[PDB]
Amino acid sequence: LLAAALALVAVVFAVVLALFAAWAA
Amino acid sequence: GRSIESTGFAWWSGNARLINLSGKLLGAHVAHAGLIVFWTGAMTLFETSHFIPEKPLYEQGMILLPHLATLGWGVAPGGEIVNTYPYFATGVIHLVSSAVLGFGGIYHSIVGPDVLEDSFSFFGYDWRDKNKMTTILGIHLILLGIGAFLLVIKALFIGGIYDTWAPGGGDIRFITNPTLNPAIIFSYLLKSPFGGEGWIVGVNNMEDVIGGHIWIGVTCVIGGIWHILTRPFSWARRAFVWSGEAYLSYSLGALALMGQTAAEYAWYNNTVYPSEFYGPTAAEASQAQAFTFLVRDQRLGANIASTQGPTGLGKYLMRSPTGEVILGGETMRFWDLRAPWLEPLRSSNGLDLNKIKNDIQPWQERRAAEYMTHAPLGSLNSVGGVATEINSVNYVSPRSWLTTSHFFLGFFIFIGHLWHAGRARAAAAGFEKGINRENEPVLSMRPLD
Amino acid sequence: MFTLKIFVYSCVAFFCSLFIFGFLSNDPSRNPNR
Amino acid sequence: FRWLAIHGLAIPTVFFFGAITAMQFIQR
Amino acid sequence: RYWVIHSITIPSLFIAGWLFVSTGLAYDVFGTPRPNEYFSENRQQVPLINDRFNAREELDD
Amino acid sequence: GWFDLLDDWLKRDRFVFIGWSGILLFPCAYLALGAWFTGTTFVSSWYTHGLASSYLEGCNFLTAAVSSPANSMGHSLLFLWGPEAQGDFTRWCQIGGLWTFTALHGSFGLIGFCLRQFEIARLVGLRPYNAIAFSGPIAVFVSVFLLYPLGQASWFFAPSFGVAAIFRFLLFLQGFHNWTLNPFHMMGVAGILGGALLCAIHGATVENTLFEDGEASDTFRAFQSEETYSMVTANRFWSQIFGVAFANKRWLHFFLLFVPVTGLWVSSIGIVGLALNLRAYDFVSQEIRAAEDPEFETFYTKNILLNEGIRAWMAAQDQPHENFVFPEEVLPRGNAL
Amino acid sequence: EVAKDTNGGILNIAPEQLKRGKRLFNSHCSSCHVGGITKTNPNIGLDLESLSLATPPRNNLDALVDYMKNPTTYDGSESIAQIHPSIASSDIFPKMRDLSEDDLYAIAAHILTQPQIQAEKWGGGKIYY
Amino acid sequence: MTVTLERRESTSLWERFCSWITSTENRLYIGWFGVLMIPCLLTATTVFIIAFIAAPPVDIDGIREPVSGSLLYGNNIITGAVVPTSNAIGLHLYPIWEAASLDEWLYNGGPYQLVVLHFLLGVAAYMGREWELSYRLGMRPWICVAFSAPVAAATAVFLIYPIGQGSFSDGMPLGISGTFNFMLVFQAEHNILMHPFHMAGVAGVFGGALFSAMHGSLVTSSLIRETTENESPNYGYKLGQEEETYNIVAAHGYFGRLIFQYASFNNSRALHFFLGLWPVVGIWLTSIGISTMAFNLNGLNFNQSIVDSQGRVINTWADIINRANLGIEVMHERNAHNFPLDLA
Ligand code: CLA
Ligand code: CLA
Ligand code: CLA
Ligand code: CLA
Ligand SMILES: CCCCCCCCCCCCCCCC(=O)OC[C@H](COP(=O)(O)OC[C@@H](O)CO)OC(=O)CCCCCCCCCCCCCCC
Ligand SMILES: CC1=C(/C=C/C(C)=C/C=C/C(C)=C/C=C/C=C(C)/C=C/C=C(C)/C=C/C2=C(C)CCCC2(C)C)C(C)(C)CCC1
Ligand SMILES: CC1=C(/C=C/C(C)=C/C=C/C(C)=C/C=C/C=C(C)/C=C/C=C(C)/C=C/C2=C(C)CCCC2(C)C)C(C)(C)CCC1
Ligand SMILES: CC1=C(/C=C/C(C)=C/C=C/C(C)=C/C=C/C=C(C)/C=C/C=C(C)/C=C/C2=C(C)CCCC2(C)C)C(C)(C)CCC1
Ligand code: OEX
Ligand SMILES: [Cl-]
Ligand SMILES: [Fe+3]
């Protein structure tokens, strides 16, 4: 509903995604 | 090899002997497709043969004819089956094609070469060849896209499709302006599967259906081209098991999910599954009963908007948790129902009490009676009604057959997915035949405590 | 009530991300025969 | 005892099978 | 070789059961009511046995 | 010697072992099974329950049965030569002599089979645990098919040998005894479900901790004093999954002997209880609370209502000899329905 | 052995007609009149007593066939062909397009013979299942 | 370049995390499936315990008649339960944050929905976890299939049936008496006893217990004398030993003489496969039965199937069981129905 939810979800997801990206590198 | 000694598999697991034999495997697939098309044709001709002109489809145990009628063949306004000949045509076509696919199947299974990698190079493959697999995947994806576009073409240009929401009752209509807006379509995709939402099962207009098939057609074609002309990235190569059994397991999981989704479509959706053909849903029938007795008792002089039930809730009319005016009783659970025979009486805040008092039509009453008397309840031996009902009505709704059968299928297919995925992992790592007596992992581990 | 929703969403996204990206980290190599 | 047992089970089984079929055609 | 005596006795027993039903001998033997013998012209109710030591005379009526 | 020659002949290694126990077992087993087929095919239950009961009448496998004797017969043994049938085979079948026939011959049959287990065990030289384990099922048959009706009015209320009939016995004991609420039955359920659990989990565990003793994917062919599966690996697995695992094979196999057998015995205690109508029907505290407080409701009270419904409606059809007449105004029911 | 008309007309019915009548009843009526209560309106059933107390009394074959041709309310004061299946409204009730006079008389025969063989069971409801 | 890509990634932080997660040295294994399982089962368990003890009554049938299910509200162990969510809600997602207050949430039966969803998730993850540890320890991977049967049952009574019926209020209550209630109503409205898949389930559990007792008694009977008198014979076995602890031939021989020679198993692998297969298939079928009856394809209906020459109904046992079914039907949820047909 609110932008805050999308903000947090995309934030955590992007963090773990970057962690994984480093691992893949 | 066609023995336990030559392959390692027994006669049961007999079919596993075909894992690395491209030719005979292809033969098996083609022959199987032959069986599918066979059944389609034969059963369609069966349904056409047993069909009776002046009875609804759902009273006659039809599951194939409602699909064709939905597509808009041989249907008059209202859902009347007038012309039963195109059904015969499709049945015949499928049957004969089944002869062709059958011949090809038997050929590649028994007559032709076992390995297609020797004599050929385009139809030959190693399971461990990622590029070839993604190529085949791409091709078939493009095919699926073409099929979606076949539906789109059929609905946009060639006669159209049966619309139960058509202004004037259910009638075949050519979809002039399909929905191409991503907000809407993908609004379906990212929506909850729970009550009042319905995910992708909650699609209630042919504009969104056909537009959705435009999107899925474009997506499948573009994806097909993508996989044909590319190779899997590093992360996918690291994350996946690359073997025949693994691919089988993936397709199994997918088909399980799809089975469940289809069961839910058959059970709740009445747009892609018109109630004129498939019969009413459970929701629709319950609401139809409430509607029916609301009308009966209102005609007997009761002010239904003020009628207090035993509980203190409305006997005929109450409110949904979010305020909407809904039908009372147990069918309060089914207030998310949308039906073409009821929406005329729908307002901004739910059911319009004025229209309920004044503008209820005879055909609506007939619809409610018919649907509440053809609710999707019945025994295994097709005794219509609740479990305590006596033997008189021979009836089980097509919705029940479709939904139950496809739950059965989806379920066992999921089991197969677990089985083959597990065995795929074990065979890839190399211990699917037992634990190595000279390399038992546990013995090389520190004890738990 | 909204803050609770934010909290739960954070938790779910967190563990789901760990699950997905975790199983992407060459899981078939995680076996005693490697 | 082999004969006695095998026939002890099989003979009435066939008798009964015939009977029940015949019942399949009994009308009201 | 052992299919001869069986080809003479197995169909014989099969037909014997068939006849045990078709002739209606089963009804007379086990006292099982025929489709038209559940209710007579005199009794319209279920003919339950009420007397333990006089069940014969009761079943005769 | 004469007896020694008899023993020698009876204990010969045939395709089907006989023995002294065979002298008791085979006749009674044969007669019980045969009586069931005979009854379910030809004999009716019109003069006992007012029901069609055989294939001859139009029953299928599910609705056909050898029904219990007429309530008026009491706990009569109902001999063919008894003072009730007086030799007349037809009247004997009409009374319900086939039920007592099947029950008694079935009982002595069970005795004979258990004695068979003991005898074969002793001859071969094994421990008689099979027979004990089988004492289980015996307790079920004795308590349910003999003790329960003997405690009640007559054999009429004993289970009828048939699918739908057994179903009737079930719903009867629910509606009248609240049998699900009985703790002994709960222990029985624990025993059965626990037994099935143990069967499944042991089978799966052994099958999935197998040693590679061959090259074929068919691991069945690859089977000695060496264990065919890794007990240590299994132990590790279930210890890390469930927190606790077996470590002793002997204790394991005894355990999956013990659980189901105990289940059966306990439920039998319960059934004896019901034979005397000594039920676990109610929780007096909640009945008193509900009597004084019309807003108090639990699933227990809901089930009590359900029982009341069952009892009325079926009472009229299930006990025809009682001539129960319930006007449609006295039948308990909710609104609309 | 039923009533043909209100004038006391009595004609016997052979099992051929009873068979055809039962089949057609189960095919065309026997939802609702699954069992000849009336699921869409339990107030007006096909029980003998309710039939006799109608106006006109549907206690006979001719009256029943008349009802199947042109149905009315229980007081006969209004038509209900737009709500109830009939020959007069077989255009909106297509299931009635394949029924002849013999069919109507067979169905009526069934309806009238049921309370004589099943007694309280006909139009009685779940009470007597 | 074959199937598995055998390679590593050099003591990275994320790799260390993945290593600890997938560690086989942990007392309790915590795979990725465990990364899903542990939080779900913990939330579910906490809410379940707290609610079972202190939760206020719940309006299960949406008719404003709250049912009491907790211990501190007059229940005992047998009658206490977590009451299913309100029929007014149906299949709507009802998280705490969608209610105006926790009190409302408790009134409408939110706890049930929460617990059920979390439990199903965590149990699916439990299944996946069984596979996972099997893979990590170099085992054959089909224990999770065996366990897939019970998961299917739970999913049937907690999710699928509410879906088919249109309300979580029809889901099985989390409690003993509530379970019995569920069973009785189910029998009334689907005649599950006359459903062949339920019969298959009964065959699965009766047969399962039978084969459990049988296998157990056989192996216990043929134990090899390794112990003194009056001492526990279990001491005659040691964990990890390679020598078999019982005479398999003696057992096979006993079983062979009990029935007949070819009725017995010789292959222990076959025997244990059968032991695993019978009840799992039974339960599979019963689970399917519960779900397909969740879409109202009910058990076999033989009500008034036998008629006499005159045309009168001759009752059978199916008619009697139908009488009982009728009793349950007319009596259940006495104030919930306003109309003659129960279609929901
Ligand atoms: C996409 C579908 C698909 C495909 C291509 C395969 C392919 C394969 N499976 Mg498989 N499987 C599937 C779905 C599929 N499975 C599903 C859905 C399940 C869950 C039930 C399984 C469970 C399964 C097991 C447990 C095993 C396989 C195995 C195999 C391999 C050998 C199969 C064989 O010889 O069959 C032989 C066929 C038969 C013996 C016929 C059995 C018929 C069943 C038991 C009755 C089904 C009832 C049916 C619907 C109608 C009833 C008949 C009635 C009309 C009289 C082969 C690679 C084997 C393997 O791993 O080898 C590598 C193996 O052990 N499968
Ligand atoms: C998607 C599958 C599907 C569905 C939904 C239907 C649905 C229907 N069919 Mg149809 N049919 C199908 C497939 C299907 N059919 C196939 C494949 C054939 C070819 C044989 C037919 C042939 C056929 C005919 C000839 C007729 C129908 C009819 C009907 C109607 C009544 C059905 C009935 O009485 O069922 C009966 C249901 C059963 C007997 C249940 C089957 C038991 C299942 C398979 C479980 C047993 C398997 C076992 C448990 C597996 C073991 C598990 C193992 C893995 C461990 C209904 C609309 C009738 C009708 O009215 O049409 C006008 C009719 O006359 N069908
Ligand atoms: C460019 C190469 C190519 C093409 C065009 C195809 C095309 C096809 N393959 Mg195929 N295949 C290929 C390469 C290719 N394959 C390779 C390299 C392999 C590995 C050896 C395989 C292995 C393989 C197997 C194992 C199977 C197929 C099957 C199929 C058919 C799918 C039918 C269906 O329901 O789809 C969906 C259908 C639609 C969405 C409808 C529209 C589809 C298009 C528009 C026309 C379809 C008409 C007709 C079926 C055939 C004409 C196709 C052709 C004109 C393109 C289709 C004809 C399956 C089959 O049943 O074959 C008969 C099957 O079982 N293929
Ligand atoms: C026909 C089906 C199909 C199949 C089998 C594949 C298979 C594959 N694709 Mg692919 N693809 C397809 C269609 C398909 N594609 C289409 C139609 C497109 C777009 C036109 C793409 C675009 C695409 C790209 C761009 C890439 C692949 C890649 C891959 C490979 C990696 C797969 C992977 O890691 O997935 C795992 C996928 C995910 C974790 C994504 C999650 C999906 C999100 C969350 C949306 C789903 C949410 C939805 C609303 C809810 C679904 C409900 C469900 C959860 C129950 C694999 C070979 C990759 C690759 O290796 O390069 C070739 C890659 O980079 N594909
Ligand atoms: C995140 C992971 C979560 C895992 C789930 C939690 C699992 C908890 C399991 C606890 C097991 C306790 C065992 C005690 C007893 C104990 O410690 O036994 C230990 C015993 C070890 O046996 P050995 O082979 O070592 O025995 C050899 C000799 O000592 C035999 O005399 O294990 C077994 O016998 C196997 C059967 C255990 C299965 C028992 C299941 C019981 C389930 C609980 C029932 C009551 C629940 C009530 C709830 C209100
Ligand atoms: C591999 C294999 C297998 C399988 C096989 C198969 C599966 C096959 C199939 C096959 C097929 C799948 C075939 C098909 C065929 C078809 C056909 C042959 C058709 C025909 C048609 C017709 C004849 C028609 C006629 C008509 C018309 C034209 C129209 C009108 C009507 C009529 C009818 C007249 C098995 C396992 C056994 C084993 C061995 C090997
Ligand atoms: C037509 C139509 C439409 C549309 C539709 C669409 C457009 C769809 C799409 C869909 C989609 C777009 C889907 C997707 C899906 C996805 C998925 C389903 C995914 C999956 C994933 C996976 C399976 C993964 C897994 C994994 C993990 C997670 C871990 C790691 C490893 C792996 C990778 C294995 C509409 C609604 C408008 C209307 C109706 C009709
Ligand atoms: C009572 C009595 C007695 C006895 C008699 C007897 C002993 C009889 C027997 C009888 C018998 C001894 C009978 C038998 C029968 C059999 C049957 C009736 C069979 C059936 C079968 C079936 C039905 C089949 C089934 C199946 C199987 C097996 C599996 C697969 C699937 C099927 C379905 C094919 C005496 C005279 C001594 C004295 C007086 C009283
Ligand atoms: O909610 Mn629980 O139970 Ca299924 O049915 Mn309708 O809803 Mn109520 O009534 Mn019956
Ligand atoms: Cl209602
Ligand atoms: Fe064992």
Give the Cα separation of F318 and G124 in Å (integer): 19
Residue B111 Cβ inside 6 Å of ligand 7? The answer reads no
Give the Cα separation of G122 and B362 in Å (integer): 29
**Contact B244/B220 with Cβ under 8 angstroms?**
no
Q: Which residues pair with H58 in a beta bridge?
A: H67
Assess whether chains F and A touch, using the rule of 3 or more C-beta pairs within 8 angstroms: no
In the 3-class helix/strand/coil scheme, how is B67-135 assigned residue by residue?
A: HHHHHCCCEECCCEECCCHHHHHHHHHHHHHHHHHHHHHHHHHHHCCCCCCCCCCCCCCCCCCHHHHHH
Give the Cα separation of B14 and B2 in Å (integer): 8
**Contact F121/F104 with Cβ under 8 angstroms?**
no
Assess whether chains B and G touch, using the rule of 3 or more C-beta pairs within 8 angstroms: yes
The structure tokens listed for F70 are 């007429």
Give the Cα separation of G121 and B348 in Å (integer): 47
Q: What is the DSSP letter of F38?
A: H
**Contact F60/F164 with Cβ under 8 angstroms?**
no
Smallest CA-to-CA distance from H273 within H148, H152, H147, H146 is with H146
Give the Cα separation of H156 and H126 in Å (integer): 17
Which atom from ligand 4 is nearest to the alpha carbon of B223? 20
Number of helical (H) and strand (E) elements in chain D, helices listed first = 1, 0
Beta strands in B107-235 (DSSP E): 161-163, 171-173
Q: Are strands B80-81 and B75-76 parallel, antiparallel or unpaired?
A: antiparallel
**Which of chain F's residues have a Cβ under 8 Å away from the Cβ of H173?**
299
Which atom from ligand 2 is nearest to the alpha carbon of B381? 34
Q: How far, in Å, from the CA of B265 to the mean position of ligand 2? A: 19
In the 3-class helix/strand/coil scheme, how is C1-34 assigned residue by residue?
A: CHHHHHHHHHHHHHHHHHHHHHHCCCHHHCCCCC
Give the Cα separation of C14 and A19 in Å (integer): 13
Give the resolution in Å.
Answer: 2.8
Residue B294 Cβ inside 6 Å of ligand 2? The answer reads no
Residue B307 Cβ inside 6 Å of ligand 4? The answer reads no
- The backbone torsions φ and ψ at residue B64, rounded to the nearest 5 degrees and listed phi first, read -90, -45
Establish whether F321 is an annotated binding residue.
Answer: no
Smallest CA-to-CA distance from H156 within H177, H172, H167 is with H172
Q: Which residues contact F50 (CB under 8 A, 6 or more apart)?
A: E46, E48, F320, H315
Give the Cα separation of F270 and H36 in Å (integer): 43
Which atom from ligand 1 is nearest to the alpha carbon of B17? 31
Q: What is the DSSP letter of F145?
A: I
Q: Are strands G10-11 and G2-3 parallel, antiparallel or unpaired?
A: antiparallel
**Contact H236/H223 with Cβ under 8 angstroms?**
yes
DSSP letters of G34-49? TTTS-TT-TTS-S-HH
Of H168, H170, H298, the residue with max ligand 9 atoms within 8 A of its CB, to mutate for a pocket test, comes to H170
Query: Which of E5, E12, E15, E22 is best to mutate for the D interface (most D CBs within 10 A)?
Result: E22
G26 touches chain B (CB under 8 A): yes
The structure tokens listed for F215 are 């090259």
C-beta atoms surrounding B100 within 10 Å: 12
Contact C6 A16 (CB under 8 A): no
Q: What is the DSSP letter of G89?
A: G
In the 3-class helix/strand/coil scheme, how is chain H assigned residue by residue?
A: CCCCCCCCCCCCHHHHHHHHHCCCCCCCCCCHHHHHHHHHHHHHHHHHHHHHHHCCCECCCCCCCCECCCHHHCCCCCCCEECCCCCCCCCCCCCHHHCCCHHHHHHHCHHHHHHHHHHHHHHHHHHHHHHHHHHHCCCCCCHHHHCHHHHHHHHHHHHHHHHHHCCHHHCCCEEHHHHHHHHHHHHHHHCHHHCHHHHHHHHHHHHHHHHHHHHHHHHHHCECCCCCCCCCHHHHCCCCCCECCECHHHHHHHHHHHCCHHHCCCCHHHHHHHHHHHHHHHHHHHHHHHHHHHCCEECCCCCCCCECCCCCECCCHHHHHHHHHHHHHHHCCCCCCCCCCCCC
Contact C21 A19 (CB under 8 A): yes
Q: Which residues of H102-126 are buried (b: 16+ CB within 10 A; e: fewer)?
A: eeebbbbbbbbbbbbbbbbbbbbbb
Q: Is C26 left (phi over 0), alpha (psi -120 to 50) or beta?
A: left
**Which of chain D's residues have a Cβ under 8 Å away from the Cβ of E25?**
none
Q: Which residues contact C4 (CB under 8 A, 6 or more apart)?
A: H96, H97
Method underlying the structure: X-ray
D vs H: CB pairs below 8 A: 3
The structure tokens listed for E52 are 């333990």
Q: Which chains touch A (3 or more CB pairs under 8 A)?
A: C, H
Q: Which residues contact B18 (CB under 8 A, 6 or more apart)?
A: B24, B25, B28
CA distances from H115 to H49, H76, H83, H85 (A): 10, 21, 11, 11
CA distances from H272 to B25, F191, F203, H239 (A): 32, 20, 4, 20
Whose CA is closest to atom 39 on ligand 7?
A: B209
DSSP letters of F58-87? T--TTT-EEPPPPGGGTT----TTSTTTTT
The total number of residues shown for chain F amounts to 337
**Which of chain A's residues have a Cβ under 8 Å away from the Cβ of C2?**
2
Of F28, F38, F59, the residue with max ligand 8 atoms within 8 A of its CB, to mutate for a pocket test, comes to F38
Q: Which chains touch E (3 or more CB pairs under 8 A)?
A: D, F, H
